Amino acid sequence: SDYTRSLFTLSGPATASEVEKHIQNAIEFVKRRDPDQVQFIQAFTEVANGLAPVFQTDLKYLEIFLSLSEPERVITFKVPWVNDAGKLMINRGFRVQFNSTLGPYKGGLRFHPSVNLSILKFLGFEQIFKNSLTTLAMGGGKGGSDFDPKGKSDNEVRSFCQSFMTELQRHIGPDTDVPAGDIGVGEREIGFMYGQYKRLSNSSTGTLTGKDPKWGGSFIRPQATGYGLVFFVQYILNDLHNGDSFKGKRVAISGSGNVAQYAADKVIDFGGIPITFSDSSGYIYEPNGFTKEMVTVLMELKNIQRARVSEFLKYSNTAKFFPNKKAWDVDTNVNVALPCACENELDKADAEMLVKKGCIIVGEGANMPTTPEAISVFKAAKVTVCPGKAANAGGVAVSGLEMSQNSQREKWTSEKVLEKLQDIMKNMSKACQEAAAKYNVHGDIISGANIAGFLKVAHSYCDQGCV
């Protein structure tokens, strides 16, 4: 029942070495088209290599992957605005509308002086497949500006947000493109942009996500990524570790932001014991673990005071702080590791420590926390690694549930949103295992997440005539 077979030049099975040669030809082609987009080339390389098992079954999938690598539409535009000194400023705005096969373009907006086309293309490309994994009808996109919010008054941010949306509104809509927040775009910016969009469009629709619950926002948004991480690991523990669970397990958490805080809260609900938190200055350790009340104290320190983790020692006599050390160094048995801080935070040496300390599963809350060599250590040790692209998708999944609520003109209760998120992570975990088994890398959830995300997009793309 393949109606698009004739369109593709490459076809049929291939050996592993043949597939790498074809992947190299694809990477070179991407290089020639965009010679200096370093981040985008690297993202294409990583995703392609993660799909090698699929390409071995049929090389047509590599051709589909290459055709998806070209964005459907990119809009770059001048943004004029007047600052509080009365001077004209000009910034660059972007919206990369990468793929809409499974639904409207979906993806955050980043306001940061480092923003450029290469960065937004790399984030938008990966966003296609993370959004695919949520099982929701969402395509992939990303946008933003080189506008730097730092040092700017509230009114200057309002002026820029209004000018930025004056152009962007022409290209977005509730069934077309639904942007969201990112670095530099939080509740303040989403509100300013929503007001401008509503005024110009003369409509109240779900054209942005991350909105305040008072006007179209959703519950569980702050907790989504941390909770979704724990839901995913809990389901992987049951399915792959023969009925195991978080109950009674000591959990080493890195990071102390929203992902780490709310992952800790859900671990406690499941009976686990979170023992560590961390930041760039060091890590704190509670030998008998953190309680919900203790996590609340930490949340106030990080979210209100924006303090270092060492400050928690003022509130707990049992807590110990270790400067310039990672959470993985803690001297105690650790049964579960949840890196929720930043990319490359868990390296080869960290993985070797955790294996000896008794770690059975790793759950990635941050993006690409585990180094390639650390993943090799865990694979050899038979320690399951839950990939971030599936496990940390709770935030975008709730963004889709926000679109659903706006489409339904109904605000769900917090309990209903939480049930929907857990069920999404349940279905996502099953899809990863099934994809891994079908392609003969059983138990490789990292491969299963790459395969499941890509294949739904690829098959639908051919269903739709490859346009």
Ligand X SMILES: NC(=O)c1ccc[n+]([C@@H]2O[C@H](COP(=O)([O-])OP(=O)(O)OC[C@H]3O[C@@H](n4cnc5c(N)ncnc54)[C@H](OP(=O)(O)O)[C@@H]3O)[C@@H](O)[C@H]2O)c1
Q: Which residues are annotated as a binding site?
A: 106, 127, 130, 181, 225, 258, 399
* Given 142, 249, 302, 456, the catalytic residue: 142
Interface with ligand X (CB under 6 A), residue from 392, 405, 433, 450: 392
* Site mask for ligand X (CB under 6 A), range 258-297, x = bound: xxx-----------------xxx-----------------
Judge contact between 368 and 344, C-beta under 8 A.
yes
Q: Looking only at residues 236 through 295 of this chain, which bind a copy of itself when binding is defined by CB under 8 A?
A: none
67 touches a copy of itself (CB under 8 A): yes
148 touches a copy of itself (CB under 8 A): no
CB atoms within 10 A of CB 277: 29
Residue 33, SS3 per DSSP: helix
Backbone CA torsion sign across 316, 320, 323, 324: negative
Nearer to ligand X, 341 or 403 (CB): 341
- For residue 402, the minimal CB distance to ligand X (Å) is 13
Q: Looking only at residues 78 through 137 of this chain, which bind a copy of itself when binding is defined by CB under 8 A?
A: 78, 80, 82, 84, 86-88, 90, 92, 100-104, 135-137
Closest residue by Cα to residue 253 from 210, 285, 222: 285
Nearer to ligand X, 22 or 389 (CB): 389
Residue 195 CA from chain centroid, whole number:
27
182 touches ligand X (CB under 6 A): no
- For residue 150, the minimal CB distance to a copy of itself (Å) is 15
Residue 212, SS3 per DSSP: coil
- For residue 154, the minimal CB distance to a copy of itself (Å) is 4
CB atoms within 10 A of CB 1: 2
What are the φ/ψ torsions at residue 149 (nearest 5 degrees)?
A: -65, -20
Closest residue by Cα to residue 43 from 55, 32, 53, 31: 31
Judge contact between 393 and 428, C-beta under 8 A.
yes
Written as six digits, the tokens of 164 are: 């930025």
345 touches ligand X (CB under 6 A): yes
Q: Looking only at residues 407 through 426 of this chain, which bind a copy of itself when binding is defined by CB under 8 A?
A: 407-411
* Site mask for ligand X (CB under 6 A), range 305-344, x = bound: -----------------------------------xxxx-
CB atoms within 10 A of CB 382: 9
- For residue 366, the minimal CB distance to a copy of itself (Å) is 26
- For residue 366, the minimal CB distance to ligand X (Å) is 3
Interface with a copy of itself (CB under 8 A), residue from 17, 36, 304, 382: 36
Q: Looking only at residues 423 through 462 of this chain, which bind a copy of itself when binding is defined by CB under 8 A?
A: 456, 459-460
- What Å distances lie between residue 90 and 74, 77, 111, CA to CA? 19, 10, 14
Q: Is 411 a catalytic residue?
A: no
Strand 250-254's sheet: what is its strand order?
320-323, 282-285, 273-279, 250-254, 336-339, 361-363, 384-386
Closest residue by Cα to residue 325 from 374, 377, 371, 280: 280
Phi-psi region of 388 (alpha: psi -120 to 50; beta: other; left: phi over 0): alpha
Backbone CA torsion sign across 353, 357, 363, 365: negative
70 touches a copy of itself (CB under 8 A): yes
Judge contact between 393 and 368, C-beta under 8 A.
no
**Which does residue 8 touch among ligand X, a copy of itself, none (CB within 5 to 8 A, set by kind)?**
a copy of itself
**Which does residue 137 touch among a copy of itself, ligand X, none (CB within 5 to 8 A, set by kind)?**
a copy of itself
**Which does residue 280 touch among ligand X, a copy of itself, none (CB within 5 to 8 A, set by kind)?**
ligand X
Nearer to a copy of itself, 82 or 437 (CB): 82
Nearest-angstrom CA–CA distance, 388 and 341: 12
Backbone CA torsion sign across 127, 129, 134, 139: positive
| Closest residue by beta carbon to ligand X | 257
**Residue 344: CB partners within 8 Å, gap ≥ 6?**
368, 369, 371
Nearest-angstrom CA–CA distance, 319 and 288: 9
Q: Looking only at residues 171 through 200 of this chain, which bind a copy of itself when binding is defined by CB under 8 A?
A: 173, 175-176, 187-188, 191-192, 194-196, 198-200
Which of these ranges, 64-72, 88-96, 251-259, 373-381, lies near ligand X under the rule CB under 6 A? 251-259
**Which does residue 4 touch among a copy of itself, ligand X, none (CB within 5 to 8 A, set by kind)?**
a copy of itself
Interface with a copy of itself (CB under 8 A), residue from 158, 250, 266, 326: 158
* Site mask for ligand X (CB under 6 A), range 94-133, x = bound: ----------------------------------------
Nearest-angstrom CA–CA distance, 208 and 221: 14
**Active-site residue list:** 142
Question: Which residues in this chain contact ligand X in the complex, by CB under 6 A?
Answer: 225, 254-260, 278-280, 340-343, 345, 365-367, 392, 395
